[PDB]
Design a protein around this ligand. Structure first.
Ligand SMILES: CCCCCCCCCCCCCCCCCC(=O)OC[C@H](CO[C@@H]1O[C@H](CO[C@H]2O[C@H](CO)[C@H](O)[C@H](O)[C@H]2O)[C@H](O)[C@H](O)[C@H]1O)OC(=O)CCCCCCCCCCCCCCCCC
Ligand code: CLA
Ligand code: CLA
Ligand code: CLA
Ligand SMILES: CC(C)=CCC/C(C)=C/CC/C(C)=C/CC/C(C)=C/CC/C(C)=C/CC/C(C)=C/CC/C(C)=C/CC/C(C)=C/CC/C(C)=C/CC1=CC(=O)C(C)=C(C)C1=O
Ligand SMILES: CC(C)=CCC/C(C)=C/CC/C(C)=C/CC/C(C)=C/CC/C(C)=C\CC/C(C)=C/CC/C(C)=C/CC/C(C)=C/CC/C(C)=C/CC1=CC(=O)C(C)=C(C)C1=O
Ligand SMILES: CCCCCCCCCCCCCCCCCC(=O)OC[C@H](CO[C@@H]1O[C@H](CO)[C@H](O)[C@H](O)[C@H]1O)OC(=O)CCCCCCCCCCCCCCCCC
Ligand SMILES: CCCCCCCCCCCCCCCCCC(=O)OC[C@H](CO[C@@H]1O[C@H](CO)[C@H](O)[C@H](O)[C@H]1O)OC(=O)CCCCCCCCCCCCCCCCC
Ligand SMILES: CCCCCCCCCCCCCCCC(=O)OC[C@H](COP(=O)(O)OC[C@@H](O)CO)OC(=O)CCCCCCCCCCCCCCC
Ligand SMILES: CCCCCCCCCCCCCCCC(=O)OC[C@H](COP(=O)(O)OC[C@@H](O)CO)OC(=O)CCCCCCCCCCCCCCC
Ligand code: HEC
Ligand code: OEX
Ligand SMILES: [Cl-]
Ligand SMILES: [Cl-]
Ligand SMILES: [Fe+2]
Lengths: 334, 51, 153, 176, 137, 102, 243, 97, 51, 51
């Protein structure tokens, strides 16, 4: 075989301990770059002027943070949506001051994660499986796109992307609630349904299978040794599991079909997370959660407060305090 | 009055002995100003040994 | 002094923190003496009362009202439209009992500092050097016992 | 009302900073992840047990054979993610274990909050920030947000206190 | 509480004479205010110039006084700066600038009276909320 | 503010950056405040004030027309922000304006 | 003639106009006509910061720095009056313009030095008996340097001068004496010196160009720490017009 | 002792009247006929040695002088405060509503 | 002003609740002077539990 | 000052201790300045030298 033929055979080989594939040829370098830059920046990067007002925020461990407070800080509001690679800076010192590592990391990560999804498809094809695991992965990936790219595009600045850190994530969430009332947005409510229900159904399915395990071991041995990798027969009694759950609620509220059951397990959380990703990606264009502020009024015209008005008071506190030195005019329009 | 040997520096003198004298942060152990060591700064040597 | 000391939020077990470790002393310090009861008055001589900090609040503003609950002074955040500043209202503080018995203060910085302490209830002098106390409240054995045994239950 | 509960916990308890809530979050999100990934893996490693393009009719509850290939699923995840399940019993017990443990951890955190026993602050950061007015982190930013929440929501959310906060005492940034 | 004639009674001219608006008048005024004015004056504040609001006291101290129906109608026909020194129809909605502010084109005398009545009544209902801004939401 | 008498070219904001005008990372004169991120915006009501180096102080001082003032007010008050039930403005705004931008 | 579309993004907008090498002439002054500077532009090319030896024996030197805030440093569109004095000298009094820019430079070791590079309230004068403006002419003058941050600025713990807390609210029972310098915000206002040296004169148009060196203090963080001495070197352009 | 100059200023007449040398221009809306024309003139021609010096502003009409005379009692003058006059704060001090 | 509950004492209050109030060093948690608790002082209780 | 600093026993490597850990600075401190040469004299004006 010619050199290119041999290289293609190696790239697409199903015998490699980790599959490479053509998506992997892009994924590996980009994810390595993103990872190396993230680790170095998280440990050692100097403070970054996130809001473009010459007030650098310290994100790295060596500059006074711990694991909970540390972060790779988003790029400066002075940069907006401008592309800021290393070679666009006069020096690495300037690049760091303006928060270039954030752009490098998130761009390489988004590209690499897209390729990760494609790689899931590709390996399924090589192994003769059905192809839709990548479709399941599209939900979290869409969420990453929403918080790292779409929201910055809509708001006009990568400085409004989610910071790469724990407390930074909390800051992003609180400001988002102040400016969009995400809690009152149906898509985030669907996301909560998705994740609460995903956890619920995870526990339910695990508990039902575990409760219907067939006896193959003694009390001194872990029941897990009752299953041998690759055995032909099923290891639990789905008929008994259905008898139990159908009597727990009622017969027709319980799956007797394992394929239907596992499809439901896949579908519930995946759809919920799709919708929550769309919630972030649409509030990116300032279509916000429901606003019932002062919706209830009495005969004279007095405002009768509701829990929504209480929420509004909390949101006002957040709004007036966030980015305390950045606003010069009365309205926060982005 | 505060040279490396007053600060408990053990490996820094060994890098300096063979010609590594500058930092990527911009300083040099001889106190000079505005000297660029290229890749082979103290930090570069450390990174090379780690890799 | 013992009764006065009970009337102080630093001894309230609901003011601590999960990872603020050690004795209460490690926080506000080792209590040394009661400074006396602080009576605030405005330029008109009317007595004013500092609103006390509820347990829920890690921080709390300084607001002074008359006996009818009408606001008469405060420490403003934004100054440009302040109407109730201690400077504007001529607020003074006089102490009765304790270390400062019979002393009156009129310097606005000093008066404000005493009001900031008055949100905590009765005012005490603390030794913060012996334990290197950091000035952040901690809970008591009552609080720690309750936490441990509720969790274990 | 539940949303107000969330925001009250953020503003007064700094609940997001609490490692027990963090473990709860890990449990809930990881449970959702396991639910989705297991459902999808089963549905995409099914055996062909019928001629229909809709594959649901090719399962019979009384059948003895596994309906999907554990071997193929294990190979796929080993090559994609590095590790994979090889024991179905362990897999399903883990699905029980994750969300249950997460919720229990969150409950412990709330027992703490019942006493105002919060993970509110990092003392080292507070000391540094008090002494150095150029030191800023996302932690200190979030504390400012909390102070805003408390001041602006307390008077109406706690009517029994009869709070009257004059406008001049409310914390506010520039222009807003 | 109820929307009574006493609430709906407001000053008519500068001499103290008062008028009693009907409930239909007040509702029409609220609707027209939302239609033509709320984009800038939601809740009695002024978005494009927060220093000036629609509080009755502020109107009373305006020159000429604007705390009465006739004053407000005249303002809507020929607006001026707060001290009355400059005419600002070129940058403020009004009948004389209806060509550049089209929403004013079809307003009638009764419509203007209704809008003014709404401006005067609303503070009697809402108190500090009117012209108070986000502090009082 | 300029009508009130401010010298907008020299007005220093709280952070040290110009309150009304500042420089973009490549030096062009642009509006200050958070809207620094939007300095790539171009529109007919604004371009008459722009010269080779960006916004021109002499033109700002002398040549802003009433139609430009009106248009700026209109757009500022019809920014594309609103709720799902079509309450115009930021999330904390009260009910009154029925508006969500196309 | 370049347009905004030609200039945007190139960095040319942060550069002052230049004069060709032929421009070595004289611009006559009438001693009776009134004069104004219609455009003054200062483009800094070097920022130097005086070191702090820690031993007051040696003579501290100005050392070079690295600019980290990009092409946002030039003062421009400055205008003012150019009075002819009795002794024949010329005095420029600045009235308005874009006469300040915040700048951050970085020293060796990573210390960042913010400063308000400015010529606010500039008053500068030439040598006596300047009947014409030539390449031998210079201006020496003084200007004001206000606080880098203004009164409303709030530090990370919400403390400020015209706004904000007046205490360290995260440390409710800490002793306040040691924290006073950080709790009590102060607004500085100092003086700076500048020298302009004319190197090119276009007699026909009244344009002048040359070099400049200014000295001033850097940011002190509203009194939280001592400022550094800064020297700014660069080029300048000015348009002189009869009035 | 380190002192907050704005807090200290609040203890002078600045805290009880319109200080012609320091106060932000929006304050003139408190009294009839001062905003914006006379307010602009006053701020521009500050500082003043005494309150009565506001009557010497060039170009004042007779009506404007009468308004100023009627309002003199609501005015005061104190030493210029750099923190209150820098940054153009007399025209826009960052407070809206 | 410096009672046991200000000093992080966890078991001391439980000994005090049931009648152990004196130390072999001569003090008592009520501040009295010259009171001898016999063997059942705080120290004696600790020793008994160890044995 | 550098030469003077060399002429000081705190920089003599034979003055340490096995369990006195850390940099030389942790001992006498971080050197800030030379105080100058000290010349001792008695009442008769004769120069004296410290052993
Ligand atoms: C199950 C999910 C849907 C179930 C339907 C529940 C809603 C019932 C219908 C009520 C409704 O909708 O009621 C709303 C209106 C009917 O109500 C009218 O709704 C109007 C909405 O404002 C609009 O009209 C105003 C008046 O002109 C202004 O112009 C404003 O700017 C403009 O937005 C006003 O409020 C009217 O007063 C009110 O009567 O119905 C509509 O519009 C009908 C909408 C059908 C088209 C779908 C809208 C397209 C969505 C694009 C975004 C999708 C992505 C984001 C997802 C999140
Ligand atoms: C009922 C139990 C109990 C209670 C209520 C107290 C209460 C007290 N003790 Mg005592 N103590 C105890 C048991 C207890 N102690 C035991 C068993 C020991 C031996 C180790 C000690 C040793 C001891 C010393 C040496 C000191 C105290 C001190 C104190 C005081 C401060 C406590 C403090 O800062 O807590 C801080 C508490 C925390 C930071 C909470 C820790 C939370 C853990 C780490 C969470 C673990 C989570 C887990 C890993 C997650 C599982 C994951 C899941 C998947 C399974 C207080 C009066 C101090 C004092 O003031 O004495 C004078 C002091 O110096 N105690
Ligand atoms: C990434 C986002 C995220 C995630 C995943 C979580 C996850 C969680 N949060 Mg945290 N939260 C977050 C962000 C997040 N949080 C933020 C940013 C804040 C602001 C501070 C909070 C504030 C917050 C608070 C204040 C609380 C949580 C709690 C919880 C837990 C809820 C557990 C549960 O299902 O209770 C759901 C309720 C139950 C399981 C109770 C039993 C329900 C019964 C069985 C339902 C029966 C219904 C019946 C059949 C009929 C209903 C029909 C009817 C509707 C008509 C869970 C670990 C809670 C917690 O920790 O509790 C210990 C809690 O109190 N969160
Ligand atoms: C050739 C080896 C060597 C040498 C000469 C130095 C020298 C130095 N180091 Mg480095 N270091 C080394 C290896 C070395 N280091 C290694 C391998 C590490 C990784 C652990 C470090 C980590 C390190 C740190 C983190 C620091 C230093 C510092 C220092 C300075 C102070 C040293 C000190 O206080 O020692 C103290 C030495 C002792 C107290 C002697 C210990 C004797 C042991 C315990 C005896 C054991 C006996 C045995 C158990 C008996 C066996 C029983 C038998 C029956 C078998 C000095 C310049 C400090 C400094 O100033 O840096 C700026 C500092 O902070 N070093
Ligand atoms: C430079 C520096 C220092 C950088 C560090 C930066 C940084 C911020 C680090 C900190 C991050 C960090 C880890 C913090 C999080 C801390 C945290 C909250 C910890 C939670 C701890 C805890 C005990 C929580 C309690 C709840 C709990 C038990 C959660 C567990 C969650 C968890 C592990 C879930 C599983 C997730 C997972 C990806 C599973 C994959 C399973 C898998 C291989 C399935 C594939 C598969 C499916 C099938 O269906 C079949 C059939 C087969 C065969 C098969 O294979
Ligand atoms: C004092 C007095 C008078 C007492 C006398 C009381 C008395 C005796 C009364 C007699 C009875 C009586 C009259 C009736 C009361 C009537 C009545 C309506 C009252 C109670 C009503 C009420 C308050 C409760 C109703 C609410 C209720 C509990 C409904 C919950 C329904 C619900 C949402 C269920 C979820 C269903 C769903 C499909 C879940 C999927 C979960 C899931 C994915 C499981 C995974 C899974 C499934 C399988 O299927 C198998 C197989 C396996 C493997 C497996 O993984
Ligand atoms: C076998 C070895 C066992 C040890 C191996 C594990 C090492 C311990 C790891 C746990 C560390 C604990 C962190 C405490 C931090 C610290 O420094 O504490 C240090 C604190 C002491 O605190 C110190 O006190 C000193 C005065 O004596 C000074 O004030 C110091 O400043 C102060 O830090 O220690 C404790 O308080 C220990 C006991 C705490 C008991 C709390 C009761 C509540 C427990 C309930 C928790 C159950 C939750 C289960 C959830 C599931
Ligand atoms: C696997 C885990 C390995 C670790 C497990 C063992 C724990 C370490 C146990 C050894 C403890 C060492 C005691 C040092 C005490 C200490 O605090 O040091 C602490 C010192 C650092 O010293 C600290 O320095 C700081 C400034 O950075 C401050 O000045 C501190 O005050 C100062 O204590 O650590 C060392 O110096 C480590 C390296 C020392 C190397 C000495 C070289 C000589 C070694 C030869 C010995 C061979 C003899 C063999 C005989 C047979
Ligand atoms: C608004 C859009 C949101 C709905 C999008 C689709 C949600 C379902 C997809 C989940 C993907 C999960 C990971 C793959 C999981 C997986 O591998 O699934 C495989 C599973 C069975 O596969 P089969 O090959 O048997 O059938 C699919 C085709 O092959 C046709 O036979 O597919 C389905 O059952 C598809 C059902 C479509 C049902 C009709 C269209 C959807 C309508 C309902 C949408 C309701 C929204 C409310
Ligand atoms: C191209 C992609 C490259 C992948 C990069 C790295 C992948 C790393 C995967 C985890 C390696 C460790 C697995 C240890 C544990 C281990 O080896 O598990 C192996 C285990 C195999 O289970 P079996 O069913 O074979 O065994 C069950 C019985 O045999 C036990 O009695 O798999 C699991 O249990 C899956 C669930 C655990 C899934 C854990 C995921 C952890 C995610 C990471 C969370 C920490 C992040 C911290 C960041 C600071
Ligand atoms: C934004 C385009 C506006 C719209 C729409 C409306 N108003 Fe307005 N109003 C606006 C400004 C900028 C000002 C102040 C202008 C100045 O220089 O003084 C005002 C002022 C008023 C006033 C006077 C307020 C007072 O004296 O205290 C009134 C009574 C008023 N405006 C009424 C009004 C009405 C009835 C409107 C709908 C027909 C309306 N305004 C719309 C800005 C804007
Ligand atoms: O950077 Mn971040 O956060 Ca979005 O809204 Mn505007 O810009 Mn800022 O203010 Mn709110
Ligand atoms: Cl923020
Ligand atoms: Cl802004
Ligand atoms: Fe399963």
């Amino acid at each position: 075989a010619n050199l290119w033929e041999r290289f293609c055979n190696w790239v697409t080989s199903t015998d490699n301990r980790l599959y490479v594939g053509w998506f992997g040829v892009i994924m590996i370098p980009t994810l390595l770059a993103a990872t190396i830059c993230f680790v170095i920046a998280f440990i050692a990067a100097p403070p970054v002027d996130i809001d473009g007002i010459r007030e650098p925020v310290s994100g790295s461990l060596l500059y006074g943070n711990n694991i909970i407070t540390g972060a790779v800080v988003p790029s400066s509001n002075a940069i907006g949506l401008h592309f800021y690679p290393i070679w666009e800076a006069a020096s690495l010192d300037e690049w760091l001051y303006n928060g270039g590592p954030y752009q490098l990391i998130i761009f390489h990560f988004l590209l690499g994660a897209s390729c990760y999804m494609g790689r899931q498809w590709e390996l399924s094809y090589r192994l003769g499986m059905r192809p839709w695991i990548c479709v399941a992965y599209s939900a979290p990936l869409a969420s990453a796109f929403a918080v790292f790219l779409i929201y910055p595009i809509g708001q006009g600045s990568f400085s409004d992307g989610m910071p790469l850190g724990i407390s930074g994530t909390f800051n992003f969430m609180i400001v988002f609630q102040a400016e969009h009332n995400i809690l009152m947005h149906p898509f985030h409510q669907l996301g909560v349904a998705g994740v609460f229900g995903g956890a619920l159904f995870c526990a339910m399915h695990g508990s039902l299978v575990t409760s219907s395990l067939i006896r193959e071991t003694t009390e001194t041995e872990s029941a897990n040794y009752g299953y041998k990798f690759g055995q032909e027969e099923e290891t639990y009694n789905i008929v008994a599991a259905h008898g139990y759950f159908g009597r727990l609620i009622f017969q027709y509220a319980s799956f007797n079909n394992s394929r239907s059951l596992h499809f439901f397990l896949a579908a519930w959380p995946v759809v919920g997370v799709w919708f929550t990703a769309l919630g972030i990606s649409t509030m990116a264009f300032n279509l916000n959660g429901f606003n019932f502020n002062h919706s209830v009024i009495d005969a004279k015209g007095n405002v009768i407060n509701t829990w929504a008005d209480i929420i509004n008071r909390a949101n006002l506190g957040m709004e007036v305090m966030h980015e305390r030195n950045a606003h010069n005019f009365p309205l926060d329009l982005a | 009055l505060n040279p490396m040997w007053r600060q408990g520096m053990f490996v820094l003198p060994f890098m300096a002995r063979l010609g590594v004298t500058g930092s990527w942060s911009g300083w040099s152990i001889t106190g000079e100003t505005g000297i660029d060591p290229g890749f082979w700064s103290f930090e570069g040597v450390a990174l090379a040994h780690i890799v | 002094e013992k009764l006065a000391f009970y009337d102080y939020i630093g001894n309230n077990p609901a003011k601590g923190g999960l990872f603020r470790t050690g004795p209460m002393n490690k926080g506000d310090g080792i209590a040394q003496a009661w400074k006396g009861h602080a009576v605030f008055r405005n330029k008109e001589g009317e007595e004013l009362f500092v609103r006390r900090m509820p347990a829920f609040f890690e921080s709390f503003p300084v607001i002074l009202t008359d006996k009818n609950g009408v606001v008469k002074a405060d420490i403003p955040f934004r100054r440009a439209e302040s109407k109730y500043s201690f400077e504007q209202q001529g607020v003074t503080v006089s102490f009765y009992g304790g270390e400062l018995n019979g002393q009156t203060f009129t310097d606005p910085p000093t008066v404000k500092s005493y009001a900031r302490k008055a949100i905590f209830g009765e005012i005490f002098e603390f030794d913060t050097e012996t334990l290197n106390s950091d000035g952040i409240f901690r809970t008591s054995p009552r609080g720690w016992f309750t936490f441990a045994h509720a969790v274990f239950a | 009302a539940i949303f107000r509960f969330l925001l009250f916990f953020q503003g007064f308890h700094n609940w997001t900073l609490n490692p027990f809530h963090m473990m709860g979050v890990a449990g809930v999100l990881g449970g959702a992840l396991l639910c989705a990934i297991h459902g999808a893996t089963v549905e995409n490693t099914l055996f062909q047990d019928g001629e229909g393009a809709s594959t649901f009719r090719a399962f019979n509850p009384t059948q003895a054979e596994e309906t999907y290939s554990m071997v193929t699923a294990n190979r796929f995840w080993s090559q994609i993610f590095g590790i994979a399940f090889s024991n179905k019993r362990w897999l399903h017990f883990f699905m029980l274990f994750v969300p249950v443990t997460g919720l229990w951890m969150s409950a412990i955190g709330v027992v703490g909050l019942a006493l105002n026993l919060r993970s509110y602050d990092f003392i080292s950061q507070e000391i540094r920030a008090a002494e150095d007015p150029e030191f800023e982190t996302f932690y200190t930013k979030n504390l400012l947000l909390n102070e805003g929440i408390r001041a602006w929501m307390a008077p109406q959310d706690q009517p029994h206190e009869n709070f009257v906060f004059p406008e001049e005492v409310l914390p506010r940034g520039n222009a807003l | 509480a109820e929307l009574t004639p006493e609430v709906l009674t407001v000053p008519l001219n500068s001499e103290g004479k008062t008028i009693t608006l009907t409930e239909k008048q007040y509702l029409e005024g609220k609707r027209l205010f939302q239609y033509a004015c709320a984009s800038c004056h939601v809740g009695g504040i002024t978005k494009t110039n927060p220093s000036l609001d629609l509080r009755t006291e502020t109107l009373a101290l305006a020159t000429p006084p604007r705390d009465n129906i006739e004053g407000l109608v005249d303002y809507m026909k020929n607006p001026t700066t707060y001290d009355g020194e400059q005419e600002i129809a070129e940058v403020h909605p009004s009948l004389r600038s209806a060509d550049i502010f089209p929403k004013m084109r079809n307003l009638t005398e009764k419509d203007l009276v209704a809008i003014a009545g709404h401006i005067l009544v609303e503070p009697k209902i809402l108190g500090d909320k009117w012209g108070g801004g986000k502090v009082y939401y | 503010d300029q009508k009130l008498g401010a010298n907008v070219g020299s007005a220093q904001g709280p952070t040290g950056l110009g309150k009304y005008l500042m420089r973009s990372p490549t030096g062009e004169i642009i509006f200050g405040g958070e809207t620094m991120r939007f300095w790539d915006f171009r529109g007919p009501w604004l371009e008459p004030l722009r010269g080779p180096n960006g916004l021109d102080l002499n033109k700002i001082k002398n040549d802003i027309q009433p139609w430009q003032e009106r248009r700026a007010a209109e757009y500022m008050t019809h920014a594309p922000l609103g709720s799902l039930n079509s309450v115009g403005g930021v999330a904390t705004e009260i009910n009154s304006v029925n508006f969500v931008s196309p | 003639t370049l347009t905004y579309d030609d200039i945007v993004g190139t960095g040319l907008a942060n550069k002052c106009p230049t004069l060709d090498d032929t421009a070595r002439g004289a611009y006559p002054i009438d001693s009776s006509q009134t004069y104004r500077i219609a455009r003054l532009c200062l483009q800094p090319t070097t920022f130097l910061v005086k070191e702090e030896p820690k031993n007051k024996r040696q003579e501290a030197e100005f050392v070079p720095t690295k600019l980290v805030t990009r092409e946002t440093t030039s003062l421009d569109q400055i205008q003012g009056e150019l009075k002819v004095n009795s002794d024949g000298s010329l005095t420029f009094v600045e009235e308005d313009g874009i006469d300040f820019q915040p700048v951050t430079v970085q020293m060796a070791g990573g210390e960042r030095i913010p400063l308000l590079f400015t010529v606010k309230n500039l008053v500068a004068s030439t040598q006596p008996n300047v009947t014409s403006i030539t390449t031998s002419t210079d201006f020496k003058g003084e200007f004001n340097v206000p606080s880098y941050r203004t009164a409303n600025f709030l530090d990370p713990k919400g403390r400020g001068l015209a706004s904000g807390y007046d205490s360290a609210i995260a440390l409710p029972q800490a002793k306040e004496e040691e924290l006073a310098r950080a709790n009590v915000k102060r607004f500085s206002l100092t003086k700076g010196q500048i020298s302009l040296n004319v190197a090119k004169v276009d007699g026909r148009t009244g344009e002048i160009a040359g070099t400049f060196e200014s000295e001033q203090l850097s940011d002190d963080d509203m009194g939280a720490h001592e400022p550094h001495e800064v020297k700014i070197q660069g080029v300048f352009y000015a348009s002189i017009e009869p009035a | 002792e380190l002192v907050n100059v704005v807090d200290e200023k609040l203890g002078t007449a600045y805290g009880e009247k319109i200080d012609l040398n320091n106060t932000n221009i929006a304050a003139f809306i408190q009294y009839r006929g001062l905003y914006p024309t006379l307010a602009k003139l006053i701020v521009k021609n500050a500082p003043y040695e005494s309150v009565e010096d506001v009557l010497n502003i060039p170009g004042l009409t007779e009506r404007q002088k009468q308004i100023l005379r009627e309002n003199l009692e609501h005015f005061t003058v104190t030493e210029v405060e750099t923190a209150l006059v820098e940054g153009g704060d007399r025209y826009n001090n960052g407070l809206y509503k």
